[PDB]
Design a protein around this ligand. Sequence first.
Ligand SMILES: N#Cc1cnn2c(O)c(Cc3ccccc3)c(Cl)nc12
Ligand SMILES: N#Cc1cnn2c(O)c(Cc3ccccc3)c(Cl)nc12
Ligand SMILES: [Cu+2]
Ligand SMILES: [Cu+2]
Ligand SMILES: [Cu+2]
Ligand SMILES: [Cu+2]
Ligand SMILES: [Cu+2]
Ligand SMILES: [Cu+2]
Ligand SMILES: [Mg+2]
Ligand SMILES: [Mg+2]
Ligand code: NA
Ligand code: NA
Ligand SMILES: [Zn+2]
Ligand SMILES: [Zn+2]
Lengths: 217, 217
Amino acid sequence: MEKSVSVILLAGSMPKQYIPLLGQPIALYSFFTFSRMPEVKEIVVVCDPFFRDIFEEYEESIDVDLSFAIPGKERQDSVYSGLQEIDVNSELVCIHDSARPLVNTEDVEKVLKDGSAVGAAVLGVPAKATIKEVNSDSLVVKTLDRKTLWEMQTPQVIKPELLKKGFELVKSEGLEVTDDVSIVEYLKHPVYVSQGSYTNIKVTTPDDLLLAERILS
Amino acid sequence: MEKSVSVILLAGSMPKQYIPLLGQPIALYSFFTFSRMPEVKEIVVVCDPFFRDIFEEYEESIDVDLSFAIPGKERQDSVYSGLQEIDVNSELVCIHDSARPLVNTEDVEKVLKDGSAVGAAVLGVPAKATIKEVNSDSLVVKTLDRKTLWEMQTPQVIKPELLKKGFELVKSEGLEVTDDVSIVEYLKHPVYVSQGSYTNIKVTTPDDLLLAERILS
Ligand SMILES: N#Cc1cnn2c(O)c(Cc3ccccc3)c(Cl)nc12
Ligand SMILES: N#Cc1cnn2c(O)c(Cc3ccccc3)c(Cl)nc12
Ligand SMILES: [Cu+2]
Ligand SMILES: [Cu+2]
Ligand SMILES: [Cu+2]
Ligand SMILES: [Cu+2]
Ligand SMILES: [Cu+2]
Ligand SMILES: [Cu+2]
Ligand SMILES: [Mg+2]
Ligand SMILES: [Mg+2]
Ligand code: NA
Ligand code: NA
Ligand SMILES: [Zn+2]
Ligand SMILES: [Zn+2]
């Protein structure tokens, strides 16, 4: 389990993931969280060359190998680029959106374990809002059961062979990728939802930055 | 269409819906929005007696009738209580969560029209997060299509007879009510989703209060 995990850290005015929270660019919070975990062998940072120095500065202080990959056009392209740089025998890849700086170590632990066990897992929390499918006539698609919808977060943790098979399938068949689990949806392999924390927010808007400071205290 | 609509305004440290935004308790923002609409004949405010004065102070300045109902145990109970106080021939009831102070008049207009036309409508916005059903083994219930999930907001607009039939059914059959459209889900009558605005937030946490000020400018 030690040094078995490769992290792909998605990090591609300043883009939101480089703005500081308490003086430290957002992307560094999750970077340091992962670096400290004995399970994590390497972090492949997917970022524009311009920002490489933000991470390279801490290279000799961290207990992981630091690598880079070039971002792609869409998120899944950035995932793929990162994937080409991971260690040839990492048992798991841990993909994380750098705009989620508050991910707790204990939650990363949990999703790593679940991904190892199941093959694929993702941190999720129950959706608090009422959420429904709406059809092409703008009508609610009704359901009769208390139904339980979950909001996916990151990390998304997967055996690299499984992820590679997913990309192979989507490219070979020309399949649509429209949300953050579309690739694994095309496979028959199960995907576990590890229960996360509502504090694991994504910083998308400058109002988020204030919520993120509020949480850090 | 003039004076055809009854609003049920759900308004049951200070509870969040009574905290000020720019000096005015949150619940008053949507109250005033509705009051100004010529379609709106009455607002039945569902609130603890303690807070009645917050609304009664403006009674002679507003061009609607102001009535009160006692809150119930759960949200649907508060809806029912309000429903017993609306005008005997309102053509539509417009149920609104007072913690949504930023609802725009043009959006209320839209959902009123759609509710009149269809019988039942609710303001919604596309969910930006990846959201999935999760089964009892904590696995993702996969879907193969680009799927479109919407977050419901308020107003929820409905012909009162339809709503009364929904309550009659749920009480007579002992049916579970677990989200904000459960009652209409038991009926066969269609429910329209009117496209709202991402600014129509619900103030649930004190960080919301800052987002709400930010939006008001
Ligand atoms: N962008 C993007 C994207 C679209 N689908 N997809 C996906 O299935 C995985 C792999 C995965 C999914 C769930 C749990 C673990 C791993 C990842 Cl990491 N990214 C994506
Ligand atoms: N609390 C609560 C609650 C549970 N179900 N339900 C419902 O179906 C309606 C009516 C309605 C639904 C959609 C569109 C318009 C009206 C309303 Cl107003 N409240 C609720
Ligand atoms: Cu190195
Ligand atoms: Cu190495
Ligand atoms: Cu946010
Ligand atoms: Cu009156
Ligand atoms: Cu009257
Ligand atoms: Cu919020
Ligand atoms: Mg398999
Ligand atoms: Mg009907
Ligand atoms: Na440099
Ligand atoms: Na009084
Ligand atoms: Zn550990
Ligand atoms: Zn009008």
